[PDB]
Amino acid sequence: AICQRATATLGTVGSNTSGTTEIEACILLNPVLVKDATGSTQFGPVQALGAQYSMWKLKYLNVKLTSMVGASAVNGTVLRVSLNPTSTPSSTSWSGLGARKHLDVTVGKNATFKLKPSDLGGPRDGWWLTNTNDNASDTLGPSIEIHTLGRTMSSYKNEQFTGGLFLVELASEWCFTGYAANPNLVNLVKSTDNQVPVTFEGSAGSPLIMNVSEGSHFARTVLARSTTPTTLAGERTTSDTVWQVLNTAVSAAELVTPPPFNWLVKGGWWFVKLIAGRTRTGSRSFYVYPSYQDALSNKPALCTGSTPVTTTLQFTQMNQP
Ligand SMILES: [Cl-]
Ligand SMILES: [Cl-]
């Protein structure tokens, strides 16, 4: 096998302004999917190798959390970094998070979450598959999620605080083995739209639909980069391109959904495929899938009932058919 080490700062964890459990990060670990901070270059070699080999593994995984504030200056928030073994959305609570492998961190303190291969091993004798075009379950691998609990307060003024709380650093070492010739996957899009208006549609037995304004950076990036939505029975045709969507904003709390998937959006991240034709006017529309495998298998989330928040969306191009 061939190895590749990499250490990078991923971004920052902000203050908790809602007093509820807030999601602040969802870090994909798959080598062709793993994400840099803007103008970061540490993971380029990892993506490159991920496109050249058919199987990958992690030898170790450290997430270092560096406080951006002093512990006596800011109070009332606990940070919880945890391992999502399969990169699968779930309906969890703070307590559920605590049932995962995880580390809690007090505001104003530093800490490092360290994981062993035992914790990170794939189903192929410890290995995972690299090619995100062809499978999810044996391919996607683990994720690091970060949440927070408790309204972040300035201790001097006993007021709401709103700055960054932690620097987030990831250190790992990917190993690769077996061959592939997939330059398809070297250019996957990873981006963010801070100005996206969003809505959800559906009726009993129909797919959950996500509408996004047709002029938005998100929308006009997805159309350009997705293949053409010509794939199929009593459903629309979808693009074969899957996107992971991550909504870290508290404004994601104002998104209503038809039953029974309000939990999935409330959870902050899910998968989508561009669907053909128009659904809401002036919008581009997507089917929503509660797992990556469901997206690849065209098994969309189906509503059971019926019933324009501008939010911010981190999105990741999952594949390149
Ligand atoms: Cl909760
Ligand atoms: Cl809870």
Numbering used by the authors: 80 to 311, 314 to 388, 397 to 410
Lines quoted from the article behind this entry:
Human astroviruses (HAstVs) are nonenveloped, positive-sense, single-stranded RNA viruses that are a leading cause of viral gastroenteritis. HAstV particles display T=3 icosahedral symmetry formed by 180 copies of the capsid protein (CP), which undergoes proteolytic maturation to generate infectious HAstV particles. The AstV CP is composed of several domains, including a highly basic N-terminal domain, a core domain, a spike domain, and a C-terminal acidic domain. To further explore the structural features of the AstV CP, we determined the crystal structures of the HAstV-1 CP core and spike domains to 2.60-Å and 0.95-Å resolutions, respectively.
